[PDB]
């Protein structure tokens, strides 16, 4: 396989200011912050993630993956910070996760935005497929909003470079072959993409709500799937159901999903039916403009 010439960038802690906690949870807390490269006269809005030798081992594996990807629909790592427990410095996505955003603004989200997000997530995933990377945890919570017009895929803690494995994982986004056999493919990412689209089309509902994860395996086996969303035409709902087929070779490819959702994005009202669809920081630079 080709040699990975990606540059790991080490960043000085004295160059960052942690401003507020963006989130806390199972992982180490994520901070909003400012990165001021010395002598460069730029202020770069960043998100800093920190969770012990087991912690540093897991965070440098994610830094390995994120340092090796360069696409507009994939979250970008700026560098790492050599703290006793290593810090991941990434680009700040000001609007949070697409899951939260779609819930907070459901009364103002139209069909043009929903289908454009579907195109953009598929472009991210098609890029990860070109790089032989299996994300394994695609979900609306792992798609971040830079602007409502631009979204990027952001969580690589489970990603693997093509997969058999052992460990904890989110069952309600997983392809049935993964639940039963711990197998993962780009095609099983397609299954989670369908669930992610369903999360968007229902303005942020939880799949298989109030059903134990232990039950999900046999619900899927008997032939059951997630319901058609109210806003959804059979055209859109059929694409989801195709991602949830049993034969993984039968599900669509990410390059085909780009085409399909792109076509539906030219006549959005024909494919999604939503009521009232028609209706000192001077030196700040976004990470996407600060190159080297
Ligand atoms: C209902 N209230 C009203 C306020 N809303 C919250 C909205 C969600 N929040 C938020 C999270 C992230 C950003 N930007 C951001 N950029 C870049 C990154 Cl890497 C990032 N990572 C991150 C952050 C927190 C949790 C998890 C992660 P992960 C594990 C996906 O890496 N986050 C901006 C915001 Cl606002 C905080 C404000 C919702 C809650």
Structure characterization notes:
The protein is α+β, with helices and mostly antiparallel strands. It has 2 domains: 10-94 and 284-289, Phosphorylase Kinase, domain 1 (2-Layer Sandwich); 96-270, Transferase(Phosphotransferase) domain 1 (Transferase(Phosphotransferase), domain 1). It contains 8 helices and 10 strands. It has helices spanning 53-67, 98-104, 111-130, 176-181, 186-201, 213-221, 234-243, 254-264; strands spanning 10-11, 16-23, 30-35, 44-49, 77-81, 87-91, 133-134, 143-147, 150-153, 160-161. The longest helix is centred in the middle third of the chain and has 20 residues, at 111-130. The site of the ligand CN1CCN(C2CCN(c3ccc(Nc4ncc(Cl)c(Nc5ccccc5P(C)(C)=O)n4)cc3Cl)CC2)CC1 has 17 residues, from strand 2 and strand 4.
Give the helix/strand layout.
Blueprint: E1 10-11, E2 16-23, E3 30-35, E4 44-49, H1 53-67, E5 77-81, E6 87-91, H2 98-104, H3 111-130, E7 133-134, E8 143-147, E9 150-153, E10 160-161, H4 176-181, H5 186-201, H6 213-221, H7 234-243, H8 254-264
Parallel strand pairs: 1-5
Antiparallel strand pairs: 2-3, 3-4, 4-6, 5-6, 7-10, 8-9
């Amino acid at each position: 396989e080709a040699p990975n010439q990606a540059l790991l960038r080490i960043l000085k802690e004295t160059e960052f200011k942690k401003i507020k906690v963006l989130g806390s949870g199972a992982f180490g807390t994520v901070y909003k912050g400012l990165w001021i490269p010395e002598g460069e006269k730029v202020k770069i809005p960043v998100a800093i993630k920190e969770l012990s030798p087991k912690a540093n081992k897991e965070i440098l594996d994610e830094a390995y993956v994120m340092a090796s990807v360069d696409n507009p629909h994939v979250c970008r790592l700026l560098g790492i910070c050599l703290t006793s427990t290593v810090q991941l410095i990434m680009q700040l996505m000001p609007f949070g996760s697409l899951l939260d955003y779609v819930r907070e603004h459901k009364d103002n989200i139209g069909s043009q935005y929903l289908l454009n997000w579907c195109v953009q997530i598929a472009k991210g995933m098609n890029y990860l497929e070109d790089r032989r990377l299996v994300h394994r945890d695609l979900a609306a919570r792992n798609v971040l909003v830079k602007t409502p017009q631009h979204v990027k895929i952001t969580d690589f803690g489970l990603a693997k470079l093509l997969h058999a494995e052992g460990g904890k994982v989110p069952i309600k986004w997983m392809a049935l072959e993964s639940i039963l056999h711990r197998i993962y493919t780009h095609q099983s990412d397609v299954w989670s993409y369908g669930v992610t689209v369903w999360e968007l089309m229902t303005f942020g509902s939880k799949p298989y709500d109030g059903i134990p994860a232990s039950e999900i395996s046999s619900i899927l086996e008997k032939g059951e799937r997630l319901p058609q969303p109210p806003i959804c035409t059979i055209d859109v709902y059929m694409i989801m159901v195709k991602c949830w087929m049993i034969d993984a070779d039968s599900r669509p490819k990410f390059r085909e999903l780009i085409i399909e959702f792109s076509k539906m994005a030219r006549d959005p009202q024909r494919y999604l039916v939503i009521q009232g669809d028609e209706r000192d920081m001077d030196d700040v630079v976004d990470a996407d403009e600060y190159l080297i």
